[PDB]
Symmetry: C6
Subunit: 221 residues, 6 copies
């Protein structure tokens, strides 16, 4: 993170050991469940590309996902260099240079250069752009490591409707279904995969029924 110096400068704030161990423990415990991506977005608030690389390098194991994530960063950095070409002549002494793709990734850039980009006015949010690339690669890792398909999420003859709905939207979240995909799935597959007794209840509920109405109705079955 970046914090303002008491004299006036903008200095880099080290990652607290609390944030470090919290990150390595939620990865050790929950692996690549969907909820660890917003947790990574929370523990990396205001971080620089060097801070982001620090959090990612402290991960033990999961090196297959780390190399996949590194390939996604390289692709996004290449697209950035295509969209933001540099007229790189001789360097200007003491002036802010335009960041390349690898500069946003924090590999070919220094902590001072990253601070100067993020604290500029207008700021070049190299930390937020890099963080957006990491979220993109993490979404691909979570989707790939999704165990079950939505076709195999069917309510058992004695499973409570709320528990089957739990597995339903848990699978939809792992498969990176957007909110509209979840809405259309609520109108169709959720009713069509409920057990016979609940399915007749959900059909008699009528179209346009909300999730509160569907779960309250099938509470008795």
């Amino acid at each position: 993170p970046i914090v303002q110096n008491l004299q006036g400068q903008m200095v880099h704030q080290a990652i607290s050991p609390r944030t470090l161990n919290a990150w390595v423990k939620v990865v050790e415990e929950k692996a690549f469940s969907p909820e660890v991506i917003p947790m990574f977005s929370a523990l990396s608030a205001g971080a620089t590309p060097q801070d982001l690389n620090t959090m990612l390098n402290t991960v033990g194991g999961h090196q297959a996902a780390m190399q996949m994530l590194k390939e996604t960063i390289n692709e996004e950095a290449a697209e950035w260099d295509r969209l933001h070409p540099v007229h790189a002549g001789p360097i200007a002494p003491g002036q802010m240079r335009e960041p390349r793709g690898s500069d946003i990734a924090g590999t070919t850039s220094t902590l001072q250069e990253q601070i100067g980009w993020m604290t500029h006015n207008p700021p070049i949010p190299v930390g937020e752009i890099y963080k957006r690339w990491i979220i993109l690669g993490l979404n691909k890792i979570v989707r790939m490591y999704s165990p079950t398909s939505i076709l195999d999420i069917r309510q058992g003859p004695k499973e409570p409707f709320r528990d089957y709905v739990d597995r339903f939207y848990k699978t939809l979240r792992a498969e990176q279904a957007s909110q509209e995909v979840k809405n259309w799935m609520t109108e169709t597959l959720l009713v069509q995969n409920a057990n016979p007794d609940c399915k007749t209840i959900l059909k008699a509920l009528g179209p346009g029924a909300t999730l509160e109405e569907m779960m309250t109705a099938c509470q008795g079955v």
Copy 2:
């Protein structure tokens, strides 16, 4: 949360890992017991709509309640757009725009826009309004997931009166009974569902008896 910059600005304060792990652990341990709603109100003091969405997205599992909560937010945001219509012409450069329903929800708004709304004078408390919508949806989830009805809360022939009163008001709290409903329930059902020996004691106590008098009297049975 929002904190004042030492130079003068109003900057966003990141959620501490302590607050994050405290929230995900009380949800993992207590699920949707009534006491986790005031705990959510405590851990989200002064938070922005982006901070609130961060706390809600870090929840693992319970995706049925999350989609229900998302439906309640959509309904309240639609009622807000009906009560506060916008005369949305061309945008004013560098000026504060009127927040829509989805802007209060933190989806179609940015962290800077939320800060500007909350730090304005008079403030547009988008964080408190969004937080009020979340409390409303959480109350519906707790009420739906209430296991027992108040009819099945009856004092056993050897259960202490205080323990039966514990289950009594615990069930009333889960079923979202207001304070007047609990007062009228104390005058009627609490006596009518006590075991025979305690019931005769509570009847001889006379009307208008307080809970201290009722629990002290049936202490011997």
Copy 3:
């Protein structure tokens, strides 16, 4: 709690998750032992009526004691309204209004109104008065939930005198005995309920003996 803003205002300070979980854990572990009341007085130092209601609402279970505590707050708020009647005409725009009983309880008052009362000069300590009502109700709950009477605290024929004195004053504290009641109980019941050998030792010690002299003398028996 209330903390001074760096610009000059008096702003509300959110309850730390450390204070929250410390409160819910000492209630989960020790229930209504006498020592949890001073702990509640320590964890609620400088709190507002809204902060106090937050700590009390985060308690899981014990709803019988919570409703008893709520009845005691209502009684004390009614006595306050009798002792401090309001000449409530039309409201004065932008001026501090006189707090009623429910305003001290934090139900009919807002966080801004509570801050203005507590930060006034002279301050209207609505937080300390409300906290004094809560301590009063908590004392009634601890006294009611006291298991043993002082008559059944008698030194066994092989129990060390210090352990019997432990149970003695532990029972006296639960039954809300004041310091003079404990002093007179030390002169009388403590000697009269010691086992025969210690009782003869305590009688030969002479009147006006201190607790250090009584426990050192019966150390051999």
Copy 4:
């Protein structure tokens, strides 16, 4: 504790939940071992008489020692009132009054009065004086609860000399032996209670031998 307000006042700083739970846990775990008295002196650095009473009242159990400690405070407060008599006429409006014995104890004094005494120039260190009374009573409790006499600390025929010296000075510390008492005990009883083989080694070491020389010599036996 007392901390300086940013505007200029001297305000009371609440006891952190870390300090509270640390105190109640070292008392729960170690009871009245000698090392808990310096720990109490460390966790109560700069505390007011109200903070000290808060830490002492949060102790669960050990009510026999608490009443003994309360008797010692009363004795020291009575000796203070004898050494510092007050010419208590009518009170001076807005002026600092002379603290009595019970005012130092924090019972007949308020937090504001204690702050004014401690922050005066020259300060009336009511917190340090009260803390000195508490240390005096705690020393009497630790000495009374000392299990073994120094006569029964004798080196076994196969116990390492360092372990017997451990029990030796551990017993001397519990019995409140000063440093000179420990020095004279090192010259005499420590050698006279070592097992025969070590005792002959310690005698041949010569007089005026240090503890390093005594423990290094008997390392082989």
Copy 5:
């Protein structure tokens, strides 16, 4: 670490017990796994050579690696003295002297001298240079303590392809393979060491296939 004094000086900030115990616990738990080197780089952000020596000396055990690390520091300090020779005449009173190799190591230098070097303008980053020597020695220790060769990382006939890729890049990271070495290893050895069914799938995928394409294809085998 170094922090600015409120008056104006640059003072040394002590290592927090959180950072200390976090370092000694990740060494106790994970030994010399690759991820503990970036963790050491994170917990030592902004540290002085004295702070670095403190963190390294608090390590219990692993004294073989500690002496190896000490030999690597001596070699790098000797190369520094060769690249930066000093014209060491008489000392200049009150002036900053040129740091030698052992001065960067923090052995022949004091905390004040290290602060003056790091807080100078331009700064002599003795902490970052020393930290770079430590990372170099730690890399040699991790590489030496690597258990398996990449030749013995072969996918079992029933091991999921992602798990074999996990062991593959985990071994490559332990053997200090750079990113290009990992890229060329992905093109060659990763396919040539997959089990027969996956190997035929990876060959039919075509050249230039990414890790996401390789792991998604062999998901069925």
Copy 6:
């Protein structure tokens, strides 16, 4: 520790409960292993003689080492009084007096006197000098409590060379061997106490071999 007051004074900063419990737990767990001495040097950064005495007095047990440590402090304080004699006439009102040996030890000096010595210009570092005496006594305690001699550290016929080197330098550290003693021991005893197969490998390696070369060579045996 000492911290600067916001008004301008230099005030004593209380030891945090984190630092206290961290010290008493590393002593409870690791006793007098060599690594607890640098840990004590880290947890006592910037401490006063009163803070140092507080940390040492909170130690439960190990009273044999505590009395040995107290004898070493007395010897060093006597040598200080010999090297720095005082011309102690009448005291100068309001002036800084020269510290004696017991004043550095923190027994015959007050917290205010210690602060004035440490915050003077030039400072009288009574805390660092006392801390240097404590490190000296702790080194004697660790050396005395060293279990094994270096003669009994011999590589087993099936022990990995790195593990035997671990026990080798672990024993050398406990016996307070300096770095040159460890270097000469690496050239001689380390090879002469390796098992026959490794010993022939280390002899064929040639003289002047480094620890990295010795451990990499004997990796196969």
